Symmetry: C5
């Protein structure tokens, strides 16, 4: 008979009145576009720009009764992407694009299949730079939720309706990792139905749960800031009269706590509000700070100076055995009131 | 009757004389374009480039009496964005673009509605890289103001006038945060009316107030630089004759003040004039610097050396009890003359 | 006779029925496209974005019987790249593009040669920003495998089949280096044959083995962190009663281990899970940490204090000669259980 | 009468012989294009790429006698930017573009006004990434001069001549700052008249004088490196026999000078030749270096050891009072021969 | 007579048979294209991407006998860049582009001049991002060679031949600097004549010799690492029994050598193989490392302990005078075997 590329020019040409600027079922029921995506790549979750990029296969299915045919024998036709301007396509856009583009390598990466009863499959390949606001109040112990919503732009709710299909709405490719986060296998699928002063515009969204890994911040930032506080408690076991040994220990410890803190503020993000890791590196500074000011109290009582001269040594050794036990206990109370309050949020 | 996409080709074609290069109300009163924006995204406020990017919905409403109609029954038509070149559009441009682009994902994100009496709604989606000069003289305690102005380019004041509409001129999306600043809910709306040697060009602007958050700079930079100055005053309570303990304290303290200062100059911005945080890390260096030079004065008087040999110890202990009280008081006077002068600006 | 540029317009014009939207051997056997690439450049293997860019010569060969000819005398014609839209080209795309583009400098860098029997050579020049997920669990001792796969987009398995040619499928240019990795001369060539709900789409892939060089991390990060652990064992040979010498050595060594660790966390990548180098800089911190706590045990036993007063010195010298030998031996056990477990993975 | 958009199509159509590829006054006197710019934005003066970006209004005025008219009543017409290809425009380009682009937001930002006698105004909006070589031999004390030149490309000197207009050739917008430099209000305006083997091509240039601000480098780099040199002179006033106090002072001072130096080499630019700030941080290292080697000379003479045993103490106290005065004087001679030689260049 | 823009449409129109897809001298001798470039800008030589960008004037001269004319009186015509698609242009491409683009600011920066006998001058303006592999084995003392080669793409050796002209093939603009390198005035010009399985393709290349400047690395990295090794030899002149002074000197010196090393690894490039500067900062670490282990040998022999008790002091002072001279001599032998081996390569 006649080839499919010439059959579609007969179906959508100047004859048959198919105007590509008019939706199907015009002045009637709204077009029911069903959508499902397929994530190929997912990463570079920035926290200064607060965005993340994704590389999807956006599939769209709707019904168009003007494209139904019965003369041609085979079931599923296909339109070349160069002739794609002669099809009513839904004006889908992402409500938080923040920049995006298509792919045009060796062929426009666009697919169109017109079925026999009028069903139309439309699959394209988009690289998105989608934006999600991130809340870094508890920085190592956080669970991020970055949304992905698909509004309509020009058609209102009574003309065009988006829906996720009932069989695998959001898939993820198998071999896909992240440098910091992990992607949970729990995709929430819900409506949003945006309102304006213009009208009710449809939208569907898919939420992704991003859990941050921990093992770098414990090994490099919590454990070295733990051992420096333990070294600051060695001063309680060294003799009281060894005066160059005590202040040489108490201040080289607050120097290696400052070096550990300042050396790791470049690896941390640059938000301007107090994190979880920022509290830990400011309270572990206090336990090294409060372990010299006891020696400012120990060496001053012993220097006051008959049994009255022996009483001041008897009080300086009293405060050297209280704080020998109190500082490994007050730091343990903080070590409980820090992890419990961040495993509960 | 006839479809809307064929009704606009009759209205704006070679018939009816609608020339798209000629403004409405030609050789008469000026066109009154009323505008309102809708910010979707707002962030990446750079301070080296001195710019910020915004993602807006630019809505424009004017009146074009050549587009009025009464034969077609429905009230609001719509033109497809492929046929948008047959409409007089206002030549709005941002006076501080510094680069911008449209969005063309799955459809040109452009909307046009011609009402029955001739009112025209025109809504597009722009990603701007707008520029605002920033004044970082008092860096943690600053209130930035970044403008957003909308000039005309080719039409003068007697041909085209921009105005903000009287009902919600600038909206902001709800779930929108910033890494460093916060966005106040107070938008100043005013005219600017730019002049040149060419003529009076209209412009309307919208100012955004950006208050900088504080909690990172106190916990990581002010409080750790505070505790180092407190540790430098421990030298006044340690004994005078403990010579390896005093200079081992006074210089490991100026080393941990240099380590705290140099480790945080990478997180700070890179402007070349003195900030608020740069005065603090240069005066807190002086109090550690002036706490060794007293011991250079203490140890030198005691080394001068009968009651004349006991007078020099009596003067060295005098200056070790004056500066034991004076340095926590002179530093308190600076700590009042620093925050009061930056909560008043 | 007639020129070749006018002979191809007769062969592919409105006459002869050559429709460029229809594959050869239509409704018959599938088109056998044979492919081979030629890497010109290869580098910038990022580990935050997890991608790498490559600059290839993509050559494609297929058979198109509608382009066969016998009237023109010469064997191989050539079509100009401006007239390239009148050829059925395969819709090859890379399944992990993550952005790509052509090259259009002084001429479209595209080549087409139609042979006499219908064989078609098609060579283009593409810059890819291909993505490979990287596994930095053992960071200096790792072997990366970054794939490069070539799917079809619109044609299924029974219409278009990709194959590597049997003579040099993947070549690499000669003078081509890398900043960190080395590129092995072993290219795995295999099929993948992706399935969807749409159909069987063909794909061929080529794997590249990337081995990381070592010489920077040994000279700058392993050997300097080795010598600091050796300096921390000098404390066992210095006298027991030299109390400012022991704690002055044990804590300036944990300060130069913190300075070596924090100064090198900027050169390392910023993944959030524990590496191989991150274990080494956390266990070598413990051996400097555990060499002061022995002196907290030595100086405390000697301070307890007749032959009972001489027994406590006899036990403090016992633990000062056990750990004089034990710490160079326990660190040797870790130095065997660290390299063996990373030369075996 | 007739509208202006239809009057210019009569004036420049297929009738009247106006060919847009032929300059006015053909085979006669050269076209005198007078130019003036208007800088909107100016910043991001990079010193690794050695470029700076500017956002200008480029106005061009020439005479075109083929566009003169007398039938239409009004004085100044205007051509829409879509119809701008039917005008002879001068082929102005910037000789050091290094990348540039136009602006096309909501309308092409282009302006054209044909006057009655034939004078043509042409104003566009360009974002340039202009390049200027920078000479960082004396880095904080430098005055940069970055040119901006406007050549012709295809027409020689006897066909097209560029000139700055005699009334405000280069303006700058009012509220315009820079992060590091300041922009002087003194614009040099001169010709360059480039020669090649092709011919004499015209060019005009405008020079901008950029003076670098100072207040950050004094407060953060010169004054903290000054106070460390003063602390290194405290060793001359401490007693000679206090041997752990002297070398503990002289080497913790060369450590805080190294920490001040290495902590600030990330904020400095990364050129590979010696700056002004690089001499200051290498000579102030010597004054701390030369304050320990005197103590290596003090402690060695006193250790040589009857009145001959008292002569070695009598010489060690001689060199401890010479260098008590000499080092605050030799450093003052350097402090004069450093600022005078950099305020004179 | 007739204008030049209408004479070229007569010469290259549908009349006269000039087909722009066919080279001159078809089925005859190959076209001899002679080329010469003119570098406007040259910089941003990256070593992570291993590329450099250049901004050139590419001039091409060939002969086309179909464009010869004798009726028009003047010698040199010119074609407007809008009508440039009706000219056979050579398909020159750079073999290592790695991305490039043209310049289209106020006019397409393209020049074409057709002489009377058929000689065709063609000058364009290209911004290249050319790639050169760099060998950083001896990093401060290196001489880089970055090539620039110009292949043909579609025409083989028997159809199109590139040559450099015999009079100034590569010029460089006068006022042109670099941040790190210097550009030598010695350009090698040679052929390469690439082979494939496709055929012999012509290519000509130009080599640029880049020499790295030295003065920053001596002043900031070699001299401060030199003076720290000199300070580590002060320990040999201080008294043997001053035990807190020796280990306080030997380990604050290995701390300021680690601070000098770790603070400068951010300014160095990030290749993963050992450099020249990386050997220097790892051998100068050993001379500070081996200056404490001698004191571990000095203090241990003196602690062994009648004239047998005086023999151990007599051996400890022997090794304190051998290594007083040996370490300034062994370090001098390394200082000769380090510069001589890097001035010879
Ligand atoms: C696309 O989806 C819309 C909404 O999901 C469909 O519109 C709905 O059509 C059904 C039947 O065609 C109607 O709902 C029910 O109809 C019965 C019979 O008239 C009536 O008794 C019920 O009270 C109810 O209205 C209704 O017209 C309409 N809306 C809703 C909310 O159900 C539409 O059919 C779908 N397909 C197309 C091609 O548009
Ligand atoms: C667009 O806005 C402009 C300015 O806002 C309008 O022009 C103004 O039109 C009004 C009446 O149409 C005039 O103002 C007053 O008119 C009365 C009656 O003639 C006169 O007695 C007053 O002295 C005053 O002029 C005036 O012509 C004009 N300008 C101002 C400043 O009021 C215009 O009508 C608006 N609409 C359109 C479609 O252009
Ligand atoms: C392109 O490649 C395909 C598959 O590689 C080729 O299709 C294969 O064609 C061969 C012979 O033309 C057939 O295989 C065998 O054919 C014999 C003879 O009929 C039969 O007895 C065997 O049982 C077997 O089917 C077969 O039709 C087909 N598929 C396979 C799997 O062999 C094709 O010929 C190639 N060329 C073109 C121009 O498409
Ligand atoms: C554009 O500018 C050029 C140069 O600035 C103008 O060309 C100059 O025209 C003037 C008079 O039209 C001539 O200069 C003098 O002319 C008198 C009278 O013939 C003669 O006695 C003098 O010796 C001198 O040549 C001259 O032809 C020409 N060049 C110079 C250097 O003055 C031109 O008129 C301007 N306008 C246009 C529309 O091209
Ligand atoms: C472009 O360049 C090519 C090669 O440089 C030129 O081709 C050469 O043309 C010359 C003479 O036209 C020939 O070389 C010699 O010719 C003499 C006389 O026939 C013969 O006796 C010698 O043995 C030698 O072949 C030759 O045909 C050819 N190739 C070489 C290698 O010399 C060509 O003429 C240049 N011009 C054009 C417009 O193509």
């Amino acid at each position: 008979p006649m080839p499919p590329s010439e059959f579609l020019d007969k179906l959508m040409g100047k004859v048959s009145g198919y105007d590509a600027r008019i939706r199907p079922n015009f002045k009637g029921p709204p077009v029911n576009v069903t959508c499902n995506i397929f994530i190929n790549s997912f990463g570079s979750i920035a926290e200064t720009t607060m965005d993340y990029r994704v590389n999807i296969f956006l599939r769209q299915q709707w019904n168009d009764p003007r494209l139904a045919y019965s003369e041609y024998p085979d079931d599923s036709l296909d339109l070349d992407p160069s002739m794609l301007d002669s099809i009513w396509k839904p004006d889908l856009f992402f409500a938080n694009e923040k920049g995006a583009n298509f792919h045009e390598v060796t062929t426009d990466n666009k697919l169109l299949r017109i079925s026999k009863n009028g069903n139309v499959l439309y699959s394209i390949r988009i690289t998105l730079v989608l934006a999600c606001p991130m809340d870094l109040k508890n920085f190592p112990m956080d669970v991020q939720t970055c949304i992905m919503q698909l509004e309509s732009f020009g058609y209102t709710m009574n003309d065009l309706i988006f829906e996720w299909d009932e069989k695998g709405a959001v898939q993820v490719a198998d071999g896909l990792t992240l440098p910091q986060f992990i992607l949970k296998e729990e995709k929430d699928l819900r409506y949003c139905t945006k309102h304006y002063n213009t009208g009710k515009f449809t939208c569907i969204e898919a939420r992704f749960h991003l859990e941050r890994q921990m093992g770098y911040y414990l090994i490099q930032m919590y454990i070295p800031s733990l051992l420096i506080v333990i070294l600051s408690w060695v001063s309680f076991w060294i003799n009281m009269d060894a005066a160059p040994a005590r202040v040489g220990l108490g201040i080289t410890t607050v120097l290696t706590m400052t070096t550990q803190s300042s050396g790791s503020r470049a690896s941390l993000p640059k938000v301007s509000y107090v994190k979880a890791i920022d509290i830990w590196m400011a309270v572990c500074l206090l336990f090294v700070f409060s372990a010299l000011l006891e020696y400012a109290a120990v060496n001053f009582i012993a220097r006051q100076h008959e049994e009255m001269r022996k009483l001041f040594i008897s009080r300086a050794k009293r405060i050297d055995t209280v704080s020998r036990v109190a500082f490994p206990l007050v730091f343990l109370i903080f070590n409980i009131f820090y992890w419990i309050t961040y495993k509960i949020i």
